[model samples]
Target: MEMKAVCVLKGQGPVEGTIHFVQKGSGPVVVSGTITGLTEGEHGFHVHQFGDNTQGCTSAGPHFNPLSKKHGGPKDQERHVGDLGNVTAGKDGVAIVSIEDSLIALSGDYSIIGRTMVVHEKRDDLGKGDNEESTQTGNAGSRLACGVIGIAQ
Candidate 1:
């Protein structure tokens, strides 16, 4: 059977989106959605460890890193299970995102349920930046939007 999930994004301001996740018996997990109210540039996207927003986005904790790997891009050979790289928004402030990854799953031990999805104010350097935060949050800057990963049809 297929596994399905979703994250309804929200920011302190106008940023918002509905991201859908689907996995059909284990090859890979697919994510797609349209985000609006960005600044016509790229933004970081990641899956955080907790669904909690008690302390705002800071309460979400780090990335969903069960293996404790260093931060990397979605396509990198070595990376966190939650590092999704970046999503680019247009001049009209819209981003139509589509992604598929083998690391993120909707079922089993690594299931992304009960987690958080965060959208940052800056681009994700994919751990390529020359700073310490590069290997952590990719220097993605402030958390512009976030949401909880939950079950879906």
Candidate 2:
């Protein structure tokens, strides 16, 4: 059977979205979602390490880097497991997110269930930022919104 999961992200403000994860036969997980109330640009998106939102996503901890890898882009071979690249919002402030990754799994030993997914305030530099701050933080800015990943039908 296909392994599937979902996350419904509520707002830190006006941000809201729901994402879906689907894996067929151990190839890759296809991620798709709709995010609204953005600033008409790219935002750093990631799956955090905790589902604990007691601190309003601040308590969620860092990206889901189980392998202790450095920050990198979605295409990087040496990136965080939670590194989901960036999602772009249009003039209407809506981001239609779509990504396929081999690292994010629903039924594996490294599953992402119950962790949080966060939306950033700025674009993710994917570890290629012009400065140290950008490079260290994946060029992604502050947090905007977040939610926890869960099992779905």
Candidate 3:
């Protein structure tokens, strides 16, 4: 199966892309996508709590932490389900991301469909920061772009 989102900046142009989620047997979900128009650096990317993008990205609420865990990297055992780590943009402001994650699912209780995909302005500290917000948000700064995750044919 496949999913996609049309990432858009509040005042700038859109970074349209499609993410394909493929699962084989009981293996992890494989996610891959190509995004453009991002600042050339590491950007915090994650699945948010809400699918609502009616009031820009903020309406998406916090990260998808159904387990109520602290913010951490994708490989961390104790972390939010949404913590997929960062995506790096090249000099041309483009990013091609491919990740195999065990915490995400297309169906069932952990299903990520109908959620929100957010790209942050700064890198995700991955719970290593000395601040309190770091445990909650990874101190990933403002949301630069956002899109609603949906199932695709």
> Distance from true position, residue 144, model 1, in Å?
0.7
For candidate 1, write residues 115-134 as lDDT tens digits. 99999999999999998999
* Residue ranges of candidate 3 with Cα displaced over 4 Å: 1-15
Superior by TM-score: candidate 2 or candidate 3: 2
lDDT of 2 by residue, 101-126 (tens): 99878876668889999999998989
**Tell me, what's the RMSD of every candidate?**
0.8, 1.2, 2.6
In order of appearance, the predictions have TM-scores of: 0.97, 0.94, 0.88
Structural RMSD, model 1: 0.8
What is the per-residue lDDT of model 3 for residues 95-115, given as tens digits with 9 covering 90 to 100? 888888888887768878888
Candidate 2 vs. true structure, TM-score: 0.94
Q: 21, model 2: CA deviation in Å?
A: 0.8
Clashes of each: 0, 0, 0
How accurate locally, in lDDT, is each candidate? 0.91, 0.88, 0.80
